[PDB]
């Protein structure tokens, strides 16, 4: 029987490194014409070409792993490896081996899971995600947290190549030298941002973001656009 | 002026390391209340919290960056400073340093890259995403590529929880053990899969994949489901 036995795989944490084990059996690894190729598949998505390792040490790897993965076999074990190093969370995925030019009698594949902890983080919610206005128009943008944030909730604008920069801070309070056309406020269980009358330099991108818990998040945005 | 003054970024590669500087300009690190945050923007995407040092060496750090990058501070520069190590492609970001409870005063962003390679990756689009079939139905899947592959095409089986299956390598070659209900081919610049008559055991997500040229690429799945 041909087949691949893989090995190895869990729960790291980011930054951490670990190797995925698949032992060959029935065939060498040496066999000229053989190679050994990892793919990965993120929970939910498609598969991803990672490397391939050849019989005479030829080998390639994809952008996304280069620098952090190396792909190794050992004749002696007839065994390949996947050295992963310098995890993130987005290395999260189930891992397969696979031998050989197409891929065939693939490893049963194993979950790697790259978390630092849960997830308890506060979903910021902004309505809506763009907008059209006129000069002179008034402007409501809305939010709302997932949890209950008390007035901690601030307002941003940033402009296409500039740094965001603060507008209202704990719900209501305009910050010094913003033009008291924005106002901020919170109904039932949601925030507002106003702008009375839309002025030229208003067009923007705005961010809605709670500080009553770490982590700090932000809403997706609303772009203000010319109509 | 009250302001902050980045430095550092550029484009590094997978795995490598870099340090951002932000120097406080009009006031102190050390005051008491002050703290620094590190903020990152994907290009087209929103804001996101990296970390927060504040005066009394108190700090949090994001998930996204646990493990990966620490925050600093050095009062003998008055600078704050971002050490990001192992970057990969998904670190790529315009990052903000923003003064303390809300972030106002931010610095002007610099861009980060991490990147090993252009982009001459070739795209593989099927069609459909999904379909509704009964047994005994005929099913035909499609697939192109965004460049010629010639007939280096082949099409995989993955059923859900279990490892991809090899069903037909180099367009239209049948794996041995397949049941010949199964066939491929190959029209005007696209790739066709067809079921002849799908049987219950067919329900699955099937993947075309070309391998003409490193890196091998996947198209992104289509389910046979029941109707």
């Known amino acids: 029987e041909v087949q691949l036995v893989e090995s190895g795989g869990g729960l790291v944490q980011p930054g951490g490194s670990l190797r995925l084990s698949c032992?060959?059996?029935?065939?060498?690894?040496?066999?000229?014409?053989?190679?050994?190729?990892?793919v990965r598949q993120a929970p939910g998505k498609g598969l991803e070409w990672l490397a391939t390792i050849w019989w005479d040490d030829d080998n390639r790897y994809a952008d996304s792993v280069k620098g952090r993965f190396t792909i190794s076999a050992d004749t002696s074990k007839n065994t390949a490896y996947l050295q992963m190093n310098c995890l993130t969370a987005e290395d999260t995925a189930v891992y397969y081996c696979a031998q050989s030019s197409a891929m065939d009698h693939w490893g049963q594949g194993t979950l790697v899971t790259v978390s630092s902890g849960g997830g308890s983080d506060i979903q910021m919610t902004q309505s809506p995600s763009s907008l059209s206005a006129s000069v002179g128009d008034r402007v409501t943008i809305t939010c709302r947290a997932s949890?209950?944030?008390?007035?901690?909730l601030n307002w941003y604008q940033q402009k296409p190549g500039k740094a965001p920069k603060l507008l209202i801070y704990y719900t209501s309070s305009l910050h010094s030298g913003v033009p008291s056309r924005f106002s901020g406020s919170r109904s039932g269980t949601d925030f507002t941002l106003t702008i009375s009358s839309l002025q030229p330099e208003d067009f923007a991108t705005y961010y809605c973001?709670?500080?009553?818990?770490?982590?700090?998040?932000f809403g997706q945005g609303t772009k203000v656009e010319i109509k | 002026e009250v302001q902050l003054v980045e430095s550092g970024g550029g484009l590094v590669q997978p795995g490598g390391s870099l340090r951002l500087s932000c120097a406080a300009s009009?006031?102190?690190?050390?005051?008491?209340?002050?703290?620094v945050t590190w903020v990152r923007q994907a290009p087209g995407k929103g804001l996101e919290w990296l970390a927060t040092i504040w005066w009394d060496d108190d700090n949090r750090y994001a998930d996204s960056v646990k493990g990966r990058f620490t925050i600093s501070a050095d009062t003998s520069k008055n600078t704050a400073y971002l050490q990001m190590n192992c970057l990969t492609a998904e670190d790529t970001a315009v990052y903000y340093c923003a003064q303390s409870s809300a972030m106002d005063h931010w610095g002007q962003g610099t861009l980060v890259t991490v990147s090993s390679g252009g982009g001459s990756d070739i795209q593989m689009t099927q069609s459909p995403s999904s379909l509704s079939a009964s047994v005994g139905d005929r099913v035909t899947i499609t697939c192109?590529?965004?460049?010629?592959?010639?007939?280096?095409?082949?099409?995989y089986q993955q059923k859900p929880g279990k490892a991809p299956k090899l069903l037909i390598y180099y367009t239209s070659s049948l794996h041995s053990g397949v049941p010949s209900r199964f066939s491929g081919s190959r029209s005007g610049t696209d790739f066709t899969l067809t079921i002849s008559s799908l049987q219950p055991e067919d329900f699955a997500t099937?993947?075309?994949?070309?391998?003409?040229?490193?890196?091998?690429?996947?198209?992104?799945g289509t389910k046979v489901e029941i109707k």
């Open positions: 009009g006031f102190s690190l050390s005051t008491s209340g002050i703290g």
């Open positions: 973001q709670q500080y009553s818990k770490f982590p700090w998040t």
């Open positions: 949890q209950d944030i008390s007035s901690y």
